[PDB]
């Protein structure tokens, strides 16, 4: 009924970043954490429901609006979106007969972690989506018995064609005052869709990135108003890869704990997770924008301007970062 706090979980995951090279992907990280509610049970089920303010009667219908959002992101061909999912379960895992047809076609592919398990993970990623080498050699060790994977790909094209590139064009622009601060946010819409790419230039990025939120970003996406403007934008390429483990023990600690892992629906024997890792990307060209991201949750492994990509009405915060 409401995927309200779902986006904020990824937003907060960006907040705890202390660096200067960011392509963070909130949608990829949040999707794996929320939908992992399926095998959770007992103590683990109640803790995640407390997280996102989901009353336990409301599980179920949450999946429905997610489906509506996934379909709504595809409304054309020039600018579209993609999303896939895939998990992994070992042969030695005592899978309940109920699950082997309840969600057989979703995932839960069987394999063995001790016979070229890295290659087994590899062969399924490229079929589901356009990812290339989300895996790494040191991902697995002697205690690996589970895995899970997410994926996002993007493609967009500007509304007003391009004309350090300076463009004289009619557009929406104004000045924003967060708190004793001055930025001139400039909206750059796309074509035949309702998604866009934003801009902002300033000096103290800490006062800017510490309050980024889908809630407040709407309040900044409308103060912009139509009037003739003249902006400059370069071509570049950004990169980021980091870790999420240290920022996860506050939300669902028991999933990592082998003693507190209450996963009693998929399987009865104990099982637990260790870490997770993320690899984000973005490219910039003249015609439009290209964006990409992925996520793994497995045992082991001045004056700049900020870019933000956002859907207009749904609120699914796509990749954000600084240049």
């Amino acid at each position: 009924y409401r995927l309200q706090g779902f986006t904020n979980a990824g937003i907060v995951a960006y907040k705890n970043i202390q660096d200067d090279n960011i392509v963070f992907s909130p949608f990829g990280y949040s999707f794996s954490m929320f939908m992992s509610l399926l095998p959770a049970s007992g103590n683990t089920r109640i803790e995640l429901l407390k997280t996102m303010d989901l009353r336990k009667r409301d599980l179920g219908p949450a999946f429905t609006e997610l489906i509506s959002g996934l379909a709504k992101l595809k409304t054309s061909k020039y600018t579209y979106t993609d999303l896939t999912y895939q998990s992994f379960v070992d042969n030695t895992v005592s899978i309940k007969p109920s699950y082997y047809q309840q969600y057989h076609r979703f995932g839960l592919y069987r394999l063995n972690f001790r016979r070229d398990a890295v290659n087994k993970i590899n062969s399924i990623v490229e079929r589901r989506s356009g990812m290339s080498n989300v895996v790494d050699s040191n991902m697995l060790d002697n205690n690996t018995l589970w895995a899970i994977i997410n994926t996002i790909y993007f493609k967009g094209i500007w509304q007003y064609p391009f004309d350090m590139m300076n463009v004289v064009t009619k557009l929406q622009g104004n000045t924003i005052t967060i708190d004793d601060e001055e930025y001139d946010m400039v909206r750059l819409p796309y074509k035949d869709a309702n998604i866009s790419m934003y801009l902002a230039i300033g000096d103290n990025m800490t006062h800017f990135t510490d309050s980024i939120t889908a809630a407040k970003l709407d309040y900044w996406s409308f103060q912009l108003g139509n009037k003739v403007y003249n902006l400059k934008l370069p071509k570049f390429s950004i990169e980021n890869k980091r870790d999420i483990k240290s920022i996860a023990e506050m939300m669902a600690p028991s999933m990592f704990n082998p003693d507190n892992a209450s996963f009693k629906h998929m399987t009865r024997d104990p099982l637990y997770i260790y870490k997770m890792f993320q690899n984000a990307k973005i490219d910039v060209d003249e015609q439009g924008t290209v964006a990409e991201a992925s996520t793994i949750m497995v045992a082991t492994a001045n004056t700049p301007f900020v870019f933000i990509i956002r859907h207009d009405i749904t609120g699914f915060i796509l990749f954000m970062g600084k240049v």
Binding site: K56, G60, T64, I67, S68, A71, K72, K74, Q102, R105
Partner: protein
Amino acid sequence: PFPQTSKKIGDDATLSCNRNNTNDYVVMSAWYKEPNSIILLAAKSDVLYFDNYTKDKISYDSPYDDLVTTITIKSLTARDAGTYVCAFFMTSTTNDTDKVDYEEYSTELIVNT
């Protein structure tokens, strides 16, 4: 054991299903092909297409009826001639409870000259 509803070359291959219990609330309805294809998934009036499928080959001509889901595949093809996997992922909303109910009624359609 449902009889195989059969149609002719390139016509309305109108398949159908049916649930048992009315008071149980449907959370999702999906249309698969055996064993794992997911021809298309849907919910309410919004249809989420999978892989290579759009409105030209399958539509959802029961968007304002919740008793039975039906499909109206046009321009029938030999590729479309196969086993079909209906789906009613079920849940109960009387009070707070943990339960899932996967009801399946697989139907076959055969096309020939």
